[PDB]
Amino acid sequence: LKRQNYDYAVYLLTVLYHESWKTEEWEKKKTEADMEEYIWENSTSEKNILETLLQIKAAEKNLELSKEELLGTKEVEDYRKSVVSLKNEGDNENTLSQYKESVKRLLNLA
Amino acid sequence: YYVDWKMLRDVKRRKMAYEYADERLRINSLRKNTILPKDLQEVADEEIASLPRDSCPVRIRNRCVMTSRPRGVKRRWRLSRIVFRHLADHGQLSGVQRAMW
Amino acid sequence: XXXXXXXXXXXXXXXXXXSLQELKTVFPHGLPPRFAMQVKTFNEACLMVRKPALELLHYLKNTNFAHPAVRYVLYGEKGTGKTLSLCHILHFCAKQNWLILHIPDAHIWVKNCRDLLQSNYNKQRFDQPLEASTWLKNFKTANEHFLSQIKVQEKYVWNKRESTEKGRPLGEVVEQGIMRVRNATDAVGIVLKELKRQSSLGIFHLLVAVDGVNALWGRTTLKREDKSPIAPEELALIHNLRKMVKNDWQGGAIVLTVSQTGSLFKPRNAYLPQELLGKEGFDALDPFIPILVSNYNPKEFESCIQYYLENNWLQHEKAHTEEGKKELLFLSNRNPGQLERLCAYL
Amino acid sequence: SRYGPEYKDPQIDKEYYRKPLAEQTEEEKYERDFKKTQLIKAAPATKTSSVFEDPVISKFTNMMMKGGNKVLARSLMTQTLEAVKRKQFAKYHAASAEEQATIERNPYTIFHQALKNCEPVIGLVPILKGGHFYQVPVPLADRRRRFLAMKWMIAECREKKHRRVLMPEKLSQELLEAFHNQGPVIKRKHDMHKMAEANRALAHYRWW
RNA sequence: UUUUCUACAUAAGAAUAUCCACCACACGAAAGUUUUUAUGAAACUAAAAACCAAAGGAGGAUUUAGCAGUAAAUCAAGAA
Ligand SMILES: Nc1nc2c(ncn2[C@@H]2O[C@H](COP(=O)(O)OP(=O)(O)O)[C@@H](O)[C@H]2O)c(=O)[nH]1
Ligand SMILES: [Mg+2]
Ligand SMILES: [Mg+2]
Ligand SMILES: [Mg+2]
Ligand SMILES: [Mg+2]
Ligand SMILES: [Mg+2]
Ligand SMILES: [Mg+2]
Ligand SMILES: [Mg+2]
Ligand SMILES: [Mg+2]
């Protein structure tokens, strides 16, 4: 009966809504590959940035080393916005323009 | 009187195939399952094998309704081409026309 | 058009000529096939300076060799002339006397390998003796002066009956890799890791060119006899050239190019880096300079046609009115490879 | 033939239309052309008003096609024009200035000169008389002979090359050797003329 | 060889009947033999892998079909 298909469809609606708000054990087990986004936190580009700035600090004879100082600066931020807009928004001209500008600032070339 | 003895035996095959149908479905439920034991499956095998073979689905033959012709049957109208053509040409068959394109 | 040597800013859209021995020493490896036929036909070796090679060469004029290795990427449409904008850099930095390590197509190592050898020295890694020996035999004529110069510091075991021990010049290790083809690939990878260890010194300025970088991180066509596909990690060659782009080292610059033509499993019309390279490729490639290489504009186009009129390579009688120019421009959309293909039969 | 007899052929040439004012009988002719309400055919897709198309090249291209591939034939023709061109460059740059005045580097005029030279003048038709088939000398119209040359070229290079030998290379070879008359194509032409002479008496068998 | 493979859709890379002892391969197994799987109460059917790779090197007398989006070649769908 169609009444039954209607009640079970609105049932599926209520059910999915009630179990969309339940966080469970395995959701803290979430793989970073499972992501619909590219989160700048805990990234590979983040550790590439920190190693490149480690070697910039080691080559410049600047003995200044911190995660707070390197990441808190404007340029790793230009890279935040550039590579998050590169991975999430996808391939584009203005986006590789953001990339060229932020890495131009990071590697010191003008 | 059904038009033939053919249609007689095939009608009895429709009644029968309707009768043992549940038995068929439920036995072949286990028989076609992988997870269950092979041992329930040998016994289920002897079981559907025990059923009268006149009650099995594939022993049934589609024939034209009125003229009984075993072959050349149009599934939707259950009618042999001879009779189909006959009926459609007099225009006694709705919507059916001669194709030109 | 007028030129002298590789570096000039106002000489964009001009024809630079080189000698034949420049062509033999600088590119012992592959040169793009259509350009090789171009040279063999006109008997003159001529290229035309492009704005991307200008931008990139002015980024390789300003290099600070104390800084870690910087990665460049050349991207664009199929046959848009991005393999040769690598050649500009290659012969300008060969004329400045650097170490030029050049791999013409990476996919050749990824695709179509006749002989797949199994190696447990490297923990389940496969090698291609063919490619290793061809590449080494090209690397020998590539740079000769520096192969007598380098001193190898390691203890090295080729066989139970043979070993080379530290203090050896690298011409010897390379030719001992060429001679016995069996272990040629291990010799290639050893040449690579010791090149990277010795690049810390002021003797080594290392320009690394691997065309079709997407082959390193791409999906592999080659398979086991089990019919099971092998990953890009399973080859000794890829596993080694993966450490050659890592930017852990100083004194060098890594110039890269992403390819459609040579690719595998990639669609024809995607010219953008992130798609070709995929998640693994772009993620492991780290911040790099994304250089766009496009088709000729009106001045580069009328310069290319000037170049084809001077050599009388356009033999069509009607190619000498503005009609011919308008039609080849409308036909090629002024794409260099496309204009090559279109002036082939004309 | 979805067209009735009513539909006249397209004139695809740009130069006739661009310059009307100096010709009286032609102004009268294309006036009578479009004034009559003449239904005019859709111009073929293979033919273009492009300054680079030669209908000769067009028909040799077509005659080389197999199955439904215009692509594969256009490519083999590209590669043949290419092989002839670059090979003529290779003969030009190895030579002396006199022969740098002589040598032809145009694959187009080399093609037209390869077919104009390969064209047999007369050709034979069998006639039945008294139960025998005699081959009789027949004067031929231009187009049939054009076809003859082209077909012979294609047939030969399909036939007699070794399996490693590519098509465009072989066809470049025979094009160049036909330019100078020394290839097997003109040998077939000459056997045509020899057989045309041995029987010339029988030309009195010809009733047309 | 206007061929064969894989990518792929229409610029690529490799293979290519004889080197010779190949650890045989170039085309060409739709055929066989094994194992699966589809259906079915019942595999004799069908499909897919692996193996195997044979005749075949454009074919005698003599003949089929086609006048345009046709022939030819490539692809899918439906009827039962
Ligand atoms: N005149 C000129 N031609 C070029 C240049 N770069 C490439 N070409 C032509 O373009 C053809 C192919 O371009 P390629 O670099 O291989 O681009 P890809 O196919 O996308 O990798 C070559 O055969 C060259 O003749 C250049 O700087 N000047
Ligand atoms: Mg039945
Ligand atoms: Mg390329
Ligand atoms: Mg190819
Ligand atoms: Mg079989
Ligand atoms: Mg075989
Ligand atoms: Mg044989
Ligand atoms: Mg007949
Ligand atoms: Mg047909």
PDB file of C-alpha atoms in Angstrom, chain C residues 34 37-38 41-43 311-319 323-325 327-328 340-341 343-346, chain D residues 14-15 49-54 74 77-79 81-82 85-86 89-90 92-94 104-108:
ATOM      1  CA  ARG C  34      59.764  16.071 -34.002  1.00  0.00           C
ATOM      2  CA  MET C  37      63.681  15.455 -37.333  1.00  0.00           C
ATOM      3  CA  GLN C  38      63.551  19.273 -37.607  1.00  0.00           C
ATOM      4  CA  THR C  41      66.243  18.074 -42.031  1.00  0.00           C
ATOM      5  CA  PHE C  42      67.433  21.699 -41.892  1.00  0.00           C
ATOM      6  CA  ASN C  43      70.899  20.542 -40.750  1.00  0.00           C
ATOM      7  CA  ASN C 311      64.422  27.722 -44.699  1.00  0.00           C
ATOM      8  CA  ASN C 312      61.890  27.499 -47.571  1.00  0.00           C
ATOM      9  CA  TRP C 313      60.186  24.652 -45.646  1.00  0.00           C
ATOM     10  CA  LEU C 314      56.766  25.850 -46.799  1.00  0.00           C
ATOM     11  CA  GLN C 315      56.728  24.655 -50.396  1.00  0.00           C
ATOM     12  CA  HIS C 316      53.147  25.657 -51.066  1.00  0.00           C
ATOM     13  CA  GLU C 317      53.001  28.473 -53.634  1.00  0.00           C
ATOM     14  CA  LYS C 318      50.043  30.088 -51.849  1.00  0.00           C
ATOM     15  CA  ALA C 319      51.716  29.986 -48.425  1.00  0.00           C
ATOM     16  CA  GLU C 323      45.922  33.946 -46.859  1.00  0.00           C
ATOM     17  CA  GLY C 324      48.311  31.139 -45.922  1.00  0.00           C
ATOM     18  CA  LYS C 325      49.116  32.770 -42.587  1.00  0.00           C
ATOM     19  CA  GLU C 327      44.572  29.709 -42.611  1.00  0.00           C
ATOM     20  CA  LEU C 328      47.453  28.098 -40.712  1.00  0.00           C
ATOM     21  CA  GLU C 340      54.734  21.656 -36.867  1.00  0.00           C
ATOM     22  CA  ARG C 341      52.256  18.915 -37.859  1.00  0.00           C
ATOM     23  CA  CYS C 343      53.670  22.599 -41.994  1.00  0.00           C
ATOM     24  CA  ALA C 344      54.819  18.963 -42.321  1.00  0.00           C
ATOM     25  CA  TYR C 345      52.767  18.139 -45.465  1.00  0.00           C
ATOM     26  CA  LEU C 346      52.563  21.685 -46.883  1.00  0.00           C
TER      27      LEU C 346
ATOM     28  CA  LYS D  14      36.012  31.998 -54.051  1.00  0.00           C
ATOM     29  CA  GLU D  15      37.788  33.817 -56.876  1.00  0.00           C
ATOM     30  CA  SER D  49      37.557  26.585 -50.340  1.00  0.00           C
ATOM     31  CA  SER D  50      40.896  26.381 -48.539  1.00  0.00           C
ATOM     32  CA  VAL D  51      43.844  27.583 -50.582  1.00  0.00           C
ATOM     33  CA  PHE D  52      45.649  24.334 -49.584  1.00  0.00           C
ATOM     34  CA  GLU D  53      43.376  21.681 -51.180  1.00  0.00           C
ATOM     35  CA  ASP D  54      44.196  19.910 -54.456  1.00  0.00           C
ATOM     36  CA  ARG D  74      44.746  11.566 -44.614  1.00  0.00           C
ATOM     37  CA  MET D  77      49.142  11.003 -47.341  1.00  0.00           C
ATOM     38  CA  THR D  78      50.500  13.480 -44.793  1.00  0.00           C
ATOM     39  CA  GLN D  79      53.386  11.080 -44.127  1.00  0.00           C
ATOM     40  CA  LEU D  81      54.086  14.297 -48.699  1.00  0.00           C
ATOM     41  CA  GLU D  82      56.338  14.560 -45.635  1.00  0.00           C
ATOM     42  CA  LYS D  85      59.572  16.772 -48.890  1.00  0.00           C
ATOM     43  CA  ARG D  86      62.251  15.930 -46.275  1.00  0.00           C
ATOM     44  CA  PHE D  89      65.779  18.265 -48.527  1.00  0.00           C
ATOM     45  CA  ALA D  90      68.256  15.410 -47.892  1.00  0.00           C
ATOM     46  CA  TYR D  92      69.370  19.112 -51.740  1.00  0.00           C
ATOM     47  CA  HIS D  93      71.771  19.606 -48.808  1.00  0.00           C
ATOM     48  CA  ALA D  94      74.159  16.846 -49.962  1.00  0.00           C
ATOM     49  CA  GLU D 104      62.627  20.108 -56.855  1.00  0.00           C
ATOM     50  CA  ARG D 105      61.732  20.445 -53.166  1.00  0.00           C
ATOM     51  CA  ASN D 106      57.987  20.926 -53.794  1.00  0.00           C
ATOM     52  CA  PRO D 107      56.165  17.595 -53.126  1.00  0.00           C
ATOM     53  CA  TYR D 108      53.054  19.018 -54.830  1.00  0.00           C
TER      54      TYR D 108
END
